[PDB]
Amino acid sequence: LQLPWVEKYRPQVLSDIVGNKETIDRLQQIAKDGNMPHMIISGMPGIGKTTSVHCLAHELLGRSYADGVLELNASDDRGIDVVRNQIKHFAQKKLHLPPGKHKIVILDEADSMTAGAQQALRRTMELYSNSTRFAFACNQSNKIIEPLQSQCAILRYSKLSDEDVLKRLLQIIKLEDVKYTNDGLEAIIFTAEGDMRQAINNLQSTVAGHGLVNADNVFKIVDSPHPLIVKKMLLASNLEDSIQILRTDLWKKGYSSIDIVTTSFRVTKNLAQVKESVRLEMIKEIGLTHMRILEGVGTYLQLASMLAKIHKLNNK
Amino acid sequence: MASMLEAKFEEASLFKRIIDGFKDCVQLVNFQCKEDGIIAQAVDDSRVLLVSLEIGVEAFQEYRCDHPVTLGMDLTSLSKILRCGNNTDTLTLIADNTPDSIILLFEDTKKDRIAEYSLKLMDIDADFLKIEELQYDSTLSLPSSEFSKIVRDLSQLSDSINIMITKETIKFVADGDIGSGSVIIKPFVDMEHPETSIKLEMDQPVDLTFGAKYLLDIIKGSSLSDRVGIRLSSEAPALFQFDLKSGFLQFFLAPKFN
Amino acid sequence: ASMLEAKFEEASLFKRIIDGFKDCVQLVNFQCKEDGIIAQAVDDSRVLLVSLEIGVEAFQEYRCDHPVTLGMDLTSLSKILRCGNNTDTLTLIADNTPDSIILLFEDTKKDRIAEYSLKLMDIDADFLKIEELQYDSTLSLPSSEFSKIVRDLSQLSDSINIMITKETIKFVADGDIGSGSVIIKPFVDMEHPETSIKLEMDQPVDLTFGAKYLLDIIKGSSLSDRVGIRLSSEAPALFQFDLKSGFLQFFLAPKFND
Amino acid sequence: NLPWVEKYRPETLDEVYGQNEVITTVRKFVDEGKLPHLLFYGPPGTGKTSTIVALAREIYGKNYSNMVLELNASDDRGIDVVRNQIKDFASTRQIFSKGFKLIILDEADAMTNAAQNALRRVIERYTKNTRFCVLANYAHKLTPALLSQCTRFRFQPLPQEAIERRIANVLVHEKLKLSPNAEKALIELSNGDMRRVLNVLQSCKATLDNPDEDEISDDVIYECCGAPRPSDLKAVLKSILEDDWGTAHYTLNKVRSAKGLALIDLIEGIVKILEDYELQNEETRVHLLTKLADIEYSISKGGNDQIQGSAVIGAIKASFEN
Amino acid sequence: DKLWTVKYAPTNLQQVCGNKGSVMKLKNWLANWENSKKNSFKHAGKDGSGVFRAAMLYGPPGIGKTTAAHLVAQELGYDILEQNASDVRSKTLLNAGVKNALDNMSVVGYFKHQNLNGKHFVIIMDEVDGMSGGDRGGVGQLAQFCRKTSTPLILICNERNLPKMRPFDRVCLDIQFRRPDANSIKSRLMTIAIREKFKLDPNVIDRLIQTTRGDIRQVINLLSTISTTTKTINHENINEISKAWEKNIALKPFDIAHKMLDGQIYSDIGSRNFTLNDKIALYFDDFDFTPLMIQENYLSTRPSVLKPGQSHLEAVAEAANCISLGDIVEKKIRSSEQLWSLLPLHAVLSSVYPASKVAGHMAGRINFTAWLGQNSKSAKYYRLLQEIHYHTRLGXXXXXXXXXXXXXXXXXXXXXXXXXXXXXXXXXXXXXXXXXXXXXX
Ligand SMILES: Nc1ncnc2c1ncn2[C@@H]1O[C@H](COP(=O)(O)OP(=O)(O)OP(O)(O)=S)[C@@H](O)[C@H]1O
Ligand SMILES: Nc1ncnc2c1ncn2[C@@H]1O[C@H](COP(=O)(O)OP(=O)(O)OP(O)(O)=S)[C@@H](O)[C@H]1O
Ligand SMILES: Nc1ncnc2c1ncn2[C@@H]1O[C@H](COP(=O)(O)OP(=O)(O)OP(O)(O)=S)[C@@H](O)[C@H]1O
């Protein structure tokens, strides 16, 4: 056994989610009442969507979750046939529930559901909405056919602020007695960009291999260009100096050309020292190079032109 | 020792034959259970055939059913279950209070084998129709195995089968493209075997045409009664009925355009 | 002279045998020796493994001087095996280092010689592994009485749980349309010993399987009229089909259930 | 008869060069019974496939085929294969030995997002009984939901050390000699990809071999894998910097057509040979790297070999007015 | 208890907000059907709805199509026999099912019988442009029924101009439904509110409709979010709950464009309270609309961020350029399901950067994206110009047609005597004219 902490400390109630407060409360209220509309919860990876819906599911059905909730995710069969039978049969199912409660059908990773299937789902959730309500969870609502979209409320989720990520991070630290450092935590936050799952996963991998969670250890499992170096390369007063950092500390040490750019962008973004106008013009450059890296031309040369163009701006 | 409904079919095979009798034209059906017995009507998917059942308390080795309860169930599922039970088995219907499901207990003489299945009920908003005993222009009756053959034969020729009752004579016709099909049978009564006799109580001629598909589906009740009653009237759906020792399975088929 | 001279008492024997493999197993290398035939193989999923053992006692004559390796395809073989009348006798014939095996059918009254050639399948694999030899529970029932319980429940779930409790063999299935449970006990009918059901238990057993395989298993019900089943928690279940001089056994892996 | 590239494939973990930090951690993980889901990512020929194959052997030995399930881009792995075959193996106990099962998904980055998503959901539900190892050249081509599910081990380009070592091995079990700075050339041109080294090395063991004891030179290598040479390249620069256009335009036009070179190659080499000069003004560096970087980019899309060349001469020349 | 779209679902065609013209066109056809039949459907009345066995309804999501068809049927006493995408409508099942009711009467039509149609069917083949691989040959068999039916047949779809729908072209009376009128939806929504015990600024009720692009079903659902979210509404709450609701659940795409375009966030001070990291993050709050939103109104602001001595115009051109670049990036992101790692750059190039160049005081007001519906117009018309080409290809690429079919307009619209002359002398028919008339218009 090796219980992942992302699973072990998965919020079991709407309360524990450090989500988007505003929206979560909206759910808390639907949990108390019961007029849960069909809904499409969309947002970036690991911010608490799948957790969210399942938590709403319980506080609504209590001991009924077992027979009143039907979950179907990407690991299950969800084609025309299942939609026209399993799902339909469920909505037609008889289940005596309190006044304002309805059976819930949870379709997670809904952006993987073929259109034809979604198309055959339409009528079912329209005809049986009086006993059955649907919850769609995805990263791209764009992949949900409009007919289904007009049938439900769209709840957008936002990435988790560093504060929020930090809180649930400490909560786990106490329950696991993990030896940490402030800089160590700043390293996780910095490398999770609003993704709680990602953060926790790293945290554990960090302790699992170094026990003590310090910046040095954290960046070891991450194994990406150390932020400090990347920074000292973007701020080098001489273009000659920074090209040396790229030659000695980055390229010669075997980091991916994609690895370099990505971190460069991440670091440029948090470069409070510089000015908004400036960080953005740089980003614009780092990105241009990045896309070049993605089109195949991920050469040393490219990275050099990047730093070169940076200096041109940070000198003008 | 925990139910509001507890019937015990004399013969397990019965309830199966009763449901295989119409589980091809109807999917969801509400079974109204009360003191006297079980009653249930359901309209076709194409809304052309109305199906009415009636199971009298005399078909169960024991029938309880305290309060009146509705058992809305999907015949395809229920059919999968009944398929389980073997020969020497006493199927027992069981339903609690305000059910979400229903139990089907398949016991055996030798109390060393017990098999019970649970079946989740359906929520059916049945458009309850007002079936009223009418006076049909003609009322015949004949062996179900014969009506079957006739219907199966003619259906190979046309999508429509015309049933004509003229001058105390039963005539079935099918006019297709490949050719036509005509069958005529005259009433009689064989004292040797009363069950092979063709009856016929005409009061007025009748000329109706039915969709071959629906007759091919109705003839499936030819496993419940060795005879089939047919009542026809120019201004009403035909009525095909099969008799059960304690009830019946009847079909109301709407005709085609003139 | 034939390095591999194998005459089956009845060609109708090797037929019921291969019917067990046929569906769940793809290709099977047949290793012959001086005491009979043996062969094994496993699902591309590595969930079920079949072990076949054919003793000379079920041969009207056996002579395989030096051991052989007969790799062959069941679908191709099962064909060749159908070309036999119920009045013929099968004879396996392979030369030194077979490049194809020969099956010979012959009568005993009229000159009729049916000789079929069959290329051999070489997969470069011969991993025969067996480790379990003592289970917490052993039970037996008629191969037909089993195959039934199996397909019944298969209708309501992808998984079937054979729960062995204090002198009670219990099969259960929970699914979307409902649940299903068949509980048969160990009983013996002095007049019908074959339909008797024996069960020797030691330590309780509780393990679920994938009906998928469980189904392909009950096809070996053609090899005999009684199936043996041995269970042991966290250990592949063994379904054996008795045969006069050998047997067909299936080793099915469970599912981690917590 | 396996081409060296395959011939010298690590049979065990102790035969993998330059990925020690990975080998050690992984092995410790198994010995301590805490093996997490694995993601082996890195460029081509770094030892990724060699490593799990070996790791799998070492762990299961011969029960390998019946305890390990491996799929790769050559296999079909759409959503169906995932909920079925993969999912089945992940939820079913082993038939032989007791323990956890291992599923290897090679070149997982070749999988579609739909499949990846399904894969991930499977890995989530059966993590408490089965172990997954995903391999890829780019983590970024992997769904965050999938990546977030495993511990990562980046396989970096083989360091001089490692590659020098393997070169030594191949030279023994093969009647072959490699001059001093010729081994160095082979290195500098393989960009840490052990695969390209073993390839050229046999493109010589079947080229120069006559007395079965010849010596491979810098040339034999530079020409083999059609790549410039300091002298040539470092010469083309001079013609561009000093000589007139017509003359330089000739030098380049000959050096590349007489050696089968391509601007792409020349540019790169020049950028580095030029990266050591002590230019006057900083803009010289900038505009230089800029235009050169632009040229290289337009080529990757096929523009006009002729113009793009004159462009290089122009860029290098123009920028040198300081 | 029930969803609002349900409890407030029309009960008479006297409650279908909009398309009243098309509803009429529908109801009529269903009225003169018996006669059209009596006359072998060869008498195209003054409406044309006389040579058609079946009608084909079509239009955007949640605008009343399914409500009308059902309602128009229940109003003329007919009984309804419907099917939709949730049913299997393959040629096989189609021919083994409904094919049999095309000339049959309702068995329910008897136990219900003064009804003049009670014993007749109106077949509603709904969601027809949803028939997937689970309906092999469905459209074909369905389009064949439109010719051989003996009872009213109503088909509904969202995209009539699709390839899969081709087989339906000439075979039926296709009545179009467009996006209902704002006043209709505004009026309707008001009525709802009043009955739901609350009030809302006509500016809020107005922008919703604009966001919903006319989806009356969506607005209703979206409008049931307030009372369902809060526990108890009060006298004062009404005016303030709109905020938390509007800036979160409802018009969130606006509060994003707002924040993004507020110059206070780009000034040195706020520049560190709301960091670069936060600005970029706002993008991931709806990375779908955000780019569309900024482009929509980055030029309707009174900038407070311009460099000293920089004109509003100049700063706009810079963002214009960035908006342009970000597009190039988007296209690639949408050319490979595995390129999501470029979104941050797109955040910068499509929103944050352009914004910073003109952020400040909101001159006009935040408008929904024009691009979406504007993308419908352009598309819905390429299909027209297309079919027009595949009818004139006989007489220049489809492009050279819209850039040369100018002269044609004259000798086809000029005066509207020489009528038949030019029309027929063009090899065009009824639809060939009705179609060419639309686009040309
Ligand atoms: N807001 C949150 N508060 C607390 N824990 C969280 C939060 N978001 C994520 N987690 C942790 O991350 C794990 C996965 O989060 P999920 O709810 O599955 O995220 P998601 O947004 O559904 O991600 P996808 O499916 O990749 S889009 C949970 O089991 C939690 O332990
Ligand atoms: N670290 C290493 N040590 C020793 N030999 C290696 C190493 N890496 C690569 N090789 C050689 O290169 C061949 C290919 O290595 P693989 O392990 O298959 O590479 P890989 O990282 O899976 O490459 P891909 O599929 O292109 S990503 C092997 O057969 C080896 O002979
Ligand atoms: N024109 C309208 N007037 C009044 N209420 C409407 C209108 N359109 C939609 N509604 C509401 O929206 C719900 C669904 O409308 P429908 O007519 O079923 O939509 P539709 O146009 O068929 O949409 P699809 O299936 O996505 S194409 C109804 O129950 C109404 O409450």
Ligand SMILES: [Mg+2]
């Ligand atoms: Mg999720």
Ligand SMILES: [Mg+2]
């Ligand atoms: Mg590989």
Ligand SMILES: [Mg+2]
């Ligand atoms: Mg509709």
